[model samples]
Target chain A: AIYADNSYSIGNTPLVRLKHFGHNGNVVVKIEGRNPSYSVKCRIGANMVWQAEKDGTLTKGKEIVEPTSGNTGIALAYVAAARGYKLTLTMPETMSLERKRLLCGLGVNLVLTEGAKGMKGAIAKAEEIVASDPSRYVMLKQFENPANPQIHRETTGPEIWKDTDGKVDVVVAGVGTGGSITGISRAIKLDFGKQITSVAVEPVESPVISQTLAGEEVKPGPHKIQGIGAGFIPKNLDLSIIDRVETVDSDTALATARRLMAEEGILAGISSGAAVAAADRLAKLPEFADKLIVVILPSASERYLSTALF
Target chain B: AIYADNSYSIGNTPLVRLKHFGHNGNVVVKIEGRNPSYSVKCRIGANMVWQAEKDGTLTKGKEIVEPTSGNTGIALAYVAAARGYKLTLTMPETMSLERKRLLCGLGVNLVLTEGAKGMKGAIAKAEEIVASDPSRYVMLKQFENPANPQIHRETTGPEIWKDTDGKVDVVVAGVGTGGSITGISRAIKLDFGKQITSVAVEPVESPVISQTLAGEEVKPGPHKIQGIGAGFIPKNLDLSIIDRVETVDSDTALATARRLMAEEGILAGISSGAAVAAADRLAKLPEFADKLIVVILPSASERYLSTALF
Candidate 1:
């Protein structure tokens, strides 16, 4: 397709089967790393920025400020770069050097927060910037934004269903902003009459979703994993739509990601590692032996080179 | 579509318009980084390996070794890792650390030669390794390989033709192994009735293709550009097919690539920077005012983070 720009050409990633992962059932992964920004966040980035523009929140010569884990910052930068927006992204200093280089290369202003404080620290940093001059900077808060989940429901969910002929019995995804899993789960239920399992994978170190779902006010700890676990329960997360929550540690996630690259030749990120590890765990279940499993790989391994995930 | 593996999901990248480069004509770039291994070389890599396998050269449990600049090694590793083949890649030490990590991550053995000797040194290193155990390692020599160009003729060329509806008046491509330009030019001639211009881009510091075409035996100098401007004129490079040659230095090429990422939001590599720079140079001409120019971007900018290209 002839796209006007990379921002316009973001989604419709391939559904590739992970043959060597030793899953009893068929394990297909939606390679979201194929997105324009080389991550799944481009889907939301494109949708959120355009939605804000549609709602007249993002005007001409407006600066965008967002708190990102890593991939979303790159995705939004990918969008904002072409659209002529002066973007300021606040993220934890714990993120890879690759992310910083990529965001800077796209001409975005970056604000780094404390590493120990997690994503919430970045959120607070961005909030401070926006509060200082609300009119100057438009904060398309992805965690609270409906457009985040809306895009996944519109594109990602439909594409997976269409690609797999609605044979995906379970959808395994890492819950970051809760946008992908929630939106995708909603679509899968709508298409397959709610007969599917939409699973969410999170960090074992900081299972914010699990704590939140257990009817507790969460004070999430820092996790080594980048994409999946969060510092807070996002409003975009639809707990009712998610069937079960899965947990994986940074070690297993990294190892599984290593296994994926070495064995399946799929160089997915740490978040993808968590999701695939969780998917592999689910695949071992006798009940899931006959099911067609679909796992979402949110980002590529190129972003994780600065860390041990590679 | 559901692929058996990511190795199968290697082609059909989007042709995106470079809208911000201020070209007089429609300057569209074939974003080959969208391939499974995030490079245009994956097209050739897939073709060469499969063709070798089909022709009984690359068999079960055989080790494949190739001298790669960077992208082709990753591309071949992507194919070999999934297909259960042990692979070794030889390259200069000056290549990016990201490529090394990616190649190793893909389970490929890498042999690095002297940085000053350029690609020819790597080629010689591969030659020594293969010569020692001729029966043990199959060197699918990409530079001289017919299958490399053949794949571009079959897939890359047809894709660009179909994407642009044969309306491409000019094609600007970097001459690496000369596979892409040769095959693409052949296909363009066959499709558009020889009414198109196929421009080859090389490094000004080491214009080996141009020097060779000037009817002299060439001893190519070293160039900082990773993908194009090899230390030797590749046998796969068909000089007859290329209409004209354009030269770019490392500085302009790298800056142009940075501009592409920041302005067009396309994160292309150094070689792509060279191609786009050449394309823009062509676009500035009063002669090319109405031409639909298509430029091939061989890889993404992620690989060049170790270098100053970022």
Candidate 2:
């Protein structure tokens, strides 16, 4: 358990069996909250920073600007701090106070945008900041970065497959940048020849990705489930690789998250509840009986302290 | 990688080298924040609960009442919830809001005691509640529980020793219930034959253990460094095992914690900062020039949010 550094300690998070979730202990959850920054986004943060550094795009004395609701900003903030780089995070002011406090504690600059516009507004502000001083600021966008999904494929996907001994039948994850689902699907298909079904979870209030996958045009709406749905389809999301899209409402997602802590001792975030809620639906179905389902809990419940979902 | 439950995933936290701390990464910190409950107390919580269950003292439907500032309560709350038991946590009203909110969100009943009396007040309340109805209420006192130190002796000590390849010259940990330092010292001496020294850390404001170790009768007072110095010496502390005591002030500990997040990417709690700060003091001295020091950071920064240390 000796790690080279904190970033090197990101992988190999526990895949724990949820005894109270499904039929017996058939359901397992990848608790990504156990990572260095307490989120799966750390994987992407490390990958993007390392890749950028290796590619000579992110040298020392450069400021890293990224648009994130919470997790990604926190992730990159720690990464930049460790590597001796200035960091600036742009996010909607409506995000959790816990996250904002955490980001500030990491000694990063924060730029809050309009809450109505959500992540898109944050992205615009980040873009403007980076464009203003291109030489000084480098934007390692999690939404569009190839390193985002690639890190999941290299680490998260392989870790899950290895932990379950390839017995995993279904994989469920909340779709934010779609990095987790897409990269995991790629790994599963590459190894098991598409036998492992990758399911994407989205907010019922938004359903932007589900609608986009279903050949419909619709705008995204606000949802209680954070870190799942973006304001628009992110470039990192692989729509073609996703087999099915599962939607959970805010009420059910929040309740499921609370139940996860109360019943199963899994203190997962709201989007994790959405993934678990969707996984429960599939778990109760006749077709998926006795199948091993693995749901990726993307973040911790600590960030949602004041929120009612806690 | 694959765990039976969340509690089973308590061990094997990373012993990460601090690159910027001192002596080019000679200082290695055992980041206990990586555990399931984000604290080293989860180990104690799991061990105490499991031992009680095995002893038939904690059956289904029995209410668990314990005195805690925060981390142990949160730990036992989840353990009780998962094992189908009601739990009540008594603590000082002056404890961090994050911990209070976290305990409430875990669906455990909270009993607030007088803040001036600190943990002693909380302990009295818990004992009163348990004494009124011994059949219905079980108090697994962490302060006196043998299982608390035993868990660290089994898991934390072995992990640190193995991770350091048995080359750890010094082991440093804060004395909260004195479980970590006492148990770790026993393990190190038992294996490494007293060549490896064990150091105990306490707040300068409340140098109870250090004073007690020095054959002085000093009362514990209020200290900003949480989880290290209790108001009184408990049954769990083994003065014979601890070789030296390091005292740090609140300002130094808080600043060290902030510097840790800003420079080392280790988002540790205030108590964790005290550990690293004490470790840094040892690392800077010529006596420990080539020595490998392992500091155990007992909790997460998430619990210390909104505090000035953050």
Candidate 3:
């Protein structure tokens, strides 16, 4: 069927089997990079905008403002541009020049926060801008927006279940806004009823969520992996439903990402590397043996060309 | 169906309609960027290697080499790595750092030629390397290879026809190796029997194919648009079947590409921009009124991030 626009072309990405990795167990990757905007965030980006439209918050001439130094900004830029809405993205100055240039190329106005302040600074800047012109701009806060997880529950979850024929033993994913894992977990648990294990991957450098359960008040440390491991716990993340959490370091994640391209022909992003690494680790375990494991590769490595993934 | 490897995910890209553009006519784009390698060359890359394996030209331990600073090299890098073969790509040093880093990240060997000599120089360098060790190196010469056009005929052409429901009035495409337009033209003409108009696009700066038909000895000039207008009439291009030729300049093509991303949410490459520009131009013409026009977007704009297309 012919797609009406790129918005309609957001979901239904490929779910491919991993032949080279994952030990003796069957490991599959839901290649979210195949989406129109080349990332999993495309779903939430379009969903958030559409939700706003449905609620009458977003109308003609309204500007979309968001704080993101990663895929969400790009995704939002793509959706907003297509839908004839002006977009203004607030990102950290430390964000990749390629991404910033891409957002600008798509006609998204960018506001760069101080590099030292990180994503939090960008978030503050976005909030400040929205407060300054509350009537003029609409902030689709991905962190708290139900639509972010709602799309995953509605689309990503069903697609995986149908694609894997409901034989998914474990659902592995890395959390950015925690929307993906949370929403997907809800859908999987609702259908399978504790039959499927949900694993969350976090960077070893900033294993906050994993460590948070261990009774440690850990401060967020700097990590190379983008999108995942945002230090503090995200409100959208459903920790109770999470079966387990896997921590992958930068070196391992980057190496695994490189190996993925070299061995499996999947040029996925660093977070995907972490997710695959987690999946491979799980596959080797005795309990998860010979079962169908599905991992979500959030984005492609094309966006991280300048990074250490190279 | 679950894909075994990325090699199995070469074609069957989405043919999406242009909702914002195309005025009164129906203009749809065959999104070749949606290919596994994110370019149209993914078909040719996998096809060439698979054919080589079938014919025993490409065997275990043999290295695949190609001269391309474009999507073909990236495609080959992906296919070669996946198929357990070593790949060496020779390109002009003037090629974008983003592409170079991407190919390197995919583990493809890089042989840089002098930028002063252009793509022809890179080709000469590749020929030299293959000639020096013909037994060890296998050159999949895209320009002269029948497999290039053959894949398009067998896969791309049929898919477009089927996707458009066999009502494709005009097929517009940019000529790079000429494989795309050539094979697609043959497929459409053979099926529809000249009812479909096949249009080829070339850079106005280097309108070799277009001017060749106009009985003018137009010297190839430098143009910003990549993949198309290779300064010479490609051997695979069947000028006889081509209904008409359209020339688009760098500015118009780049502007159209930006407009595509901003308006239609299709972040297509420069060559795709030129093709879309031609399609939009054709859509405006009186003769092509209400025709179902299918333009081939050869690659995504991500590949051209470092270029002026941004």
Candidate 4:
């Protein structure tokens, strides 16, 4: 069926049914991990890359640089490779081996910094690379890019609403740069108003965006979940749209991730595990028991399994 | 929002758009790899577990057992943990450490077979254990089970048909158990007639299905692509639905996978790479120019990284 120049983009993954932990409510998951890139990052990646090209920053034969731990790198690498753009990714050395290999296989230039430096090191290095070769490189800093949020607002949010026929009452998600949740929440609220409840879940140790809804600062803790909880509020974060913030311990996150896979048959990233955990807790409330609740966002399966196996 | 049960089943992943090698055709990928378990195996895991429970094969306090080279075990472990089922997995020791760690972290009972015995040894040992202790464990033999194909035929197939608005032209997918592509293809063809072209991509080394498709007996060969390209035809393989069979060399498969991540921003498994390679080749034919193609199927992203990296 593929004709000449056919795209590899695929769609319509199943909205799978899930068994909640002792909860009476039914859980339905829109299996977005079914994409070719195997991550929600694909949506944002396409949007970001396309926007860059439209904005005249991403042209042929130029390089695109970014600082990311995993999913974003894979996404950017995919787009860059297809469009004939060179890609440079700076990531924390402690990131999973699968992610590293995925990027390398794509022929992307990789820069790994000390684990202690974390993502910050990757960011700093990427910045230096862009500054040194402004003519050769373009940087779409996902953390601050409105385009990152726009992709979700325009695509993911609408897909969920259409897929579920606007039955989604509550949305639960873990924050990466806050683009996915914020964008989707903004769109859903615009479409559904007060009927839509937005919840943010994070790792207990996440340094990015650890503040309470009341604006109280919280200490970041260590968590095994990747690509979601952050130490700081990303540039694209709009906390005004969030109704609640939930923090999950690493043990709970991993346990939830494992359980979801076994019982519900939803393979998700660790942060998605946290989000699902938080969503189930909310769905069990007497007020929310009958309402339709939706959890959003995830890293790619590759990132999850790269280090997950051993 | 979780009130009682927390599960890692998030929805609303991105819809990626792709333009396969030089022609102008369009393709869309739904990145199922975004799931926490990082593969479409999540769907299988979900369906199989639910079926087991429905059939009374899964009693409380019993353990689940499965044999996988990697991804399925992690997926099963994840779901079992969520459902409060204990798990025992038999995997070839040759698999990546990441697969082991992911299952171990989920508290699965891990049994590693001798590396020389490969997957055959793992499956044999698992069957032996299941036969010996039928009362204590349930084996979801994905290779032989109708349930595997049923899940795809019922869920994955319809999901794509509806998602694409029944306009799919070509379907390209790799053969793992042949459950995913074969089952989905059968459903698609049933809905769309023979006009929909379905191509099966196999690893060159594991020529069993391809050889059979070509009307020859097969002898196994080394394959770098993981989680797919079997030494024998799966019981679920519905070759009648497949229009063409293509074999991809390991290097091309790996390179294609790497490029898929880089160019299209799709973080796909190595088998996906092989499939895409074949799909891309199909797209390059002059007769196929300017057509709509769908080439996304169930595969894990983590294994690609593990295989390529470590």
Number of the predicted model whose lDDT against the real structure is largest? 3
Off by over 4 Å in 1: A22-25, A92-98, A112-121, A191-194, A215-219, B22-25, B91-98, B112-121, B191-194, B216-219
How many pairs of residues collide in each model?
Answer: 0, 0, 0, 89
Among all windows of 10 consecutive residues in model 3 chain A, the one with the lowest summed lDDT is A187-196
TM-score per prediction, in order, is: 0.94, 0.96, 0.95, 0.77
TM-score for candidate 3: 0.95
lDDT of 3 by residue, A1-310 (tens): 6777777778888877887788653888988888778899999989999999999999997788998857888888888877788898888888777887788888888898998997788889999999998888999989889999899998999888888778888999998789999889988888556568889899999999878988887767888887898887888888998989899998888888888888777889999999999999989887887788999999888888777887
Best by the DockQ measure: 1
Model 2, A1-310: lDDT tens per residue? 5676778788688998887677767789998998888899989989999999989999988889888747888888778877788898888888777777788888888888999998789889998998898998999878888999999888899888888988899999998888999888888888556578889898888989878777888778888898887757888988888888898999999999988888877788898889999998998887887899999999888878878774
- Rank by TM-score, highest first: 2, 3, 1, 4
Q: Say which prediction, candidate 1 or candidate 3, comes out ahead on lDDT.
A: 3
DockQ per candidate, 2 decimals: 0.73, 0.68, 0.66, 0.29
TM-score of 2: 0.96
Q: After superposition, how far is residue A257 of candidate 3 from its true place, in Å?
A: 0.9
Candidate 3 lDDT by residue in tens digits, B215-249:
98878999999889889988888888899999999
What is candidate 2's CA lDDT for residue A130? 89
Model 4, A122-213: lDDT tens digits are 88888988899899988898888888989878877877787677888877778878887888898888865645887777777764454655
lDDT of 3: 0.86
